[PDB]
Paper text:
Here we studied 30 congeneric ligands that each present a distinct heteroarene for stacking between tyrosine residues at the dimer interface of procaspase-6. Complex X-ray crystal structures of 10 analogs showed that stacking geometries were well conserved, while high-accuracy computations showed that heteroarene stacking energy was well correlated with predicted overall ligand binding energies. Here we employed a congeneric set of molecular glues for procaspase-6 to study diverse heteroarene stacking on tyrosine side chains under physiologically relevant conditions. As a model system, this protein–ligand interaction exhibits desirable features such as a shape-persistent binding site, a conserved ligand binding mode across diverse analogs, and the positioning of the probe heteroarene at the terminus of the ligand structure.
To confirm that binding poses and stacking interactions were conserved across analogs 1–30, we solved procaspase-6 complex crystal structures for 10 representative analogs spanning 3 orders of magnitude in measured KD value. Importantly, all 10 structures revealed binding poses almost exactly analogous to that adopted by 1, with the probe heterocycles positioned in apparently productive stacking interactions with tyrosine 198A and 198B. Also consistent with established guidance was the trend of increasing potencies from thiophene to furan, to pyrazole and imidazole (7 and 8) as well as the favorable effect of N-methylation of nitrogen-bearing heterocycles in the context of indazole (cf. 9 vs 15), imidazole (cf. 8 vs 18), and triazole (cf. 22 vs 24). Recently, Bootsma et al. noted the importance in heteroarene stacking of the relative positioning of ring heteroatoms in otherwise similar heterocycles. By contrast, the distal arrangement is favored when the heteroatoms are “dissimilar” (i.e., one is an amine-like nitrogen atom). We evaluated these predictions across the four relevant comparator sets, confining the analysis to analogs bearing an ortho N atom capable of IMHB formation. In the case of rings with dissimilar heteroatoms, we observe distal positioning to be favored, as predicted (cf. 7 and 8 vs 9 and 18 vs 15).
Residue numbers in the entry:
A (entry chain B): 30 to 167, 187 to 293
B (entry chain A): 30 to 167, 187 to 299
Amino acid sequence: MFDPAEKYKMDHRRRGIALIFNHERFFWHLTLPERRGTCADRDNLTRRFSDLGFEVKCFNDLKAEELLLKIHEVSTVSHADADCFVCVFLSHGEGNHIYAYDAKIEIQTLTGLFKGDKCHSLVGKPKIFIIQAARGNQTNITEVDAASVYTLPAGADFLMCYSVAEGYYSHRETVNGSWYIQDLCEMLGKYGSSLEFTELLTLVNRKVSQRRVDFCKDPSAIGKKQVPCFASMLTKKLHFFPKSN
Amino acid sequence: MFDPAEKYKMDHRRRGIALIFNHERFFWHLTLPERRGTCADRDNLTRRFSDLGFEVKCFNDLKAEELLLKIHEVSTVSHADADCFVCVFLSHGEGNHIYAYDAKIEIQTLTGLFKGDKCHSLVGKPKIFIIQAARGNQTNITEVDAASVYTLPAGADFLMCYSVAEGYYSHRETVNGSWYIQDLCEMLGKYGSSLEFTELLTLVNRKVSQRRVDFCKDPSAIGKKQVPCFASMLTKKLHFFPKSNENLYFQ
Ligand SMILES: Oc1cc(F)ccc1CNc1ncccc1-c1ncc[nH]1
């Protein structure tokens, strides 16, 4: 009795945790620009994910050691009573690395912690990573970075979500925050509870691609489009229906 | 006017083309194994895509020059009257390369041909690439390769579909063909016309992950799972509803 309309079970006592690593400054000797606007993203996400029933936990400007500890901590805690896990990175990145305050971190190792091997509590449950990261270029101005981070998948039941794809460009308003996050959170607010999540992520792909970049106050920032992607290795439909309590 | 249930328009006169590049042998001096079973995949796809209304066009064992020509040809023809475009690679691959008969080809350049810049006829229409490619290892046995090809996205309105993800392994029965393709085509046959395509691709992710690899006739082929992925850069729902062909020209 193989079922095509089959959903992940989102009926556990609690929804689960949403981690937000939020990097705005970096160690001088990396020569990486302030991400002015990232707090907008952090707060906006914190709201939308709280409203979907996540225990949200933000961490501003962790060093590597500090970060790996917090995320290892979370992997080893029991998620037995939780629907799913979410993790979000607002930073800079190159290839398969995210930037902590002090140095870069292999994404593989962070996702590697929730691989069913290493985190039994989350085997068979969706593990969403959302990554607003790009190459730091050097009232409310729009700053624009080149795509830099590889749009890798992880393992089974992981959904990797990316602000921008290879070739394209990533925009952040210094007050309103990243385009990706603005539009993501708009969709979460409107449709989070009703829509299948990938269906929604596709709405975000539309919303962001459709942002016009022809008439721009910077001459050199003209014709730099943004197209986000996502790499689903999910095996079922994913809905965030209101939990009864 | 913004609509969350918004679909790609699949009401053009014809559905479109499905290209299938199908590599079974390779130039001696590459030292790459025969992909015995790939014809199973080719025929199975050819059927399922024909049934969805695609003009299917297969190409067995093209050299690089031959391949680039056939695919450039197709990019420059007008797709104005077509719903979408599909392209499929049954070969070996490393990183961002597919293997033609004679040498490797940067995938970026093949997808690059349908980028709205370069192919106006397909701007705003879905461009699906399906890639059954992996590292050649060295009646019906199951052969098993390590994932090798990067699970890259392309541009806007591209859906990149991959037999296997980094770290995992890719299986092909020498008579029944690739696990990915068997399960893909099973789902296409059952659900192709009704279901949203990515919804279906997720069914394939389930079907393939769920294949057991504990009790195996090769000792060393035990505990090598297969998990395929897909990278959607699509912007709307994608359905392959039956086209209304009741006394009308579909050629
Ligand atoms: O997505 C990108 C973004 C970029 F800025 C530059 C290149 C890409 C595409 N490459 C990949 N895409 C998916 C999985 C792995 C890779 C990868 N690993 C090693 C080299 N490529």
